[PDB]
Amino acid sequence: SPQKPIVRVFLPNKQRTVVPARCGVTVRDSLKKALMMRGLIPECCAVYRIQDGEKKPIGWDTDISWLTGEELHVEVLENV
């Protein structure tokens, strides 16, 4: 059976996407599709992985297979 794990991200405005945890792909490329298919852009966003009530800001050049199957968050770089 084709076993391909996914990653549960949360896009701006309480959106959510799951993208296959590509080993050899940055969260940039992976979530790029996620945002780009949603009319959004990763450039004005950041990735986090929430542990025990704690936010771990991830790099877009970080590989998404690191965060395989974890719930990540994509928040808007909007200083308001």
Coordinates of C-alpha atoms in Angstrom, one line a residue:
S1 CA 0.0 0.0 0.0
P2 CA 1.3 3.5 -1.1
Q3 CA 2.1 4.9 2.4
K4 CA 2.5 8.6 2.1
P5 CA 2.2 10.6 5.4
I6 CA 0.8 14.1 5.5
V7 CA 1.2 17.3 7.6
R8 CA -1.8 19.2 9.0
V9 CA -1.1 22.9 8.6
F10 CA -3.4 25.8 9.4
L11 CA -3.4 28.6 6.9
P12 CA -4.5 32.3 7.6
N13 CA -8.1 33.0 8.6
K14 CA -8.5 29.6 10.4
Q15 CA -7.8 27.6 7.3
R16 CA -6.3 24.1 7.2
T17 CA -4.5 21.9 4.7
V18 CA -2.7 18.6 4.8
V19 CA 0.3 18.1 2.5
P20 CA 2.3 14.9 2.0
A21 CA 5.4 15.0 4.2
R22 CA 7.9 15.0 1.3
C23 CA 11.4 14.0 2.4
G24 CA 13.5 16.2 0.2
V25 CA 11.1 19.1 0.1
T26 CA 11.1 22.3 2.1
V27 CA 8.0 23.4 3.9
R28 CA 8.3 26.2 1.5
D29 CA 7.7 24.1 -1.6
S30 CA 5.2 21.8 0.1
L31 CA 3.1 24.6 1.8
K32 CA 3.7 26.7 -1.3
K33 CA 1.2 24.5 -3.0
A34 CA -1.0 24.6 0.1
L35 CA -1.1 28.4 0.0
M36 CA -0.8 28.9 -3.7
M37 CA -3.8 26.6 -4.3
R38 CA -5.6 28.8 -1.8
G39 CA -4.5 32.1 -3.5
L40 CA -2.1 32.9 -0.7
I41 CA 1.7 33.3 -0.6
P42 CA 4.2 31.8 1.8
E43 CA 6.4 34.9 1.6
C44 CA 4.0 36.8 3.9
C45 CA 3.6 33.9 6.2
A46 CA 5.4 31.8 8.8
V47 CA 5.3 28.2 9.9
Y48 CA 4.9 27.0 13.5
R49 CA 4.6 23.7 15.3
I50 CA 2.7 24.0 18.5
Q51 CA 3.9 21.7 21.3
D52 CA 2.7 21.9 24.9
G53 CA 1.1 25.3 24.5
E54 CA 4.3 26.5 22.9
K55 CA 4.9 27.8 19.4
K56 CA 8.0 26.6 17.5
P57 CA 8.5 28.9 14.5
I58 CA 9.8 26.8 11.7
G59 CA 11.9 27.9 8.7
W60 CA 10.4 27.8 5.2
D61 CA 13.7 26.3 4.0
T62 CA 13.1 23.6 6.6
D63 CA 12.2 20.1 5.3
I64 CA 8.6 19.2 5.9
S65 CA 9.4 15.5 6.5
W66 CA 10.8 16.7 9.8
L67 CA 7.3 17.7 10.9
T68 CA 5.7 14.5 9.4
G69 CA 2.2 14.2 10.6
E70 CA 2.3 17.2 13.0
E71 CA -0.2 20.0 13.0
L72 CA 1.6 23.1 11.8
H73 CA 0.4 26.7 11.5
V74 CA 0.9 29.3 8.8
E75 CA 0.4 32.8 10.1
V76 CA 0.5 36.1 8.3
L77 CA 3.5 38.4 8.6
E78 CA 1.3 41.4 9.3
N79 CA 2.5 43.9 11.9
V80 CA -0.9 45.2 13.0

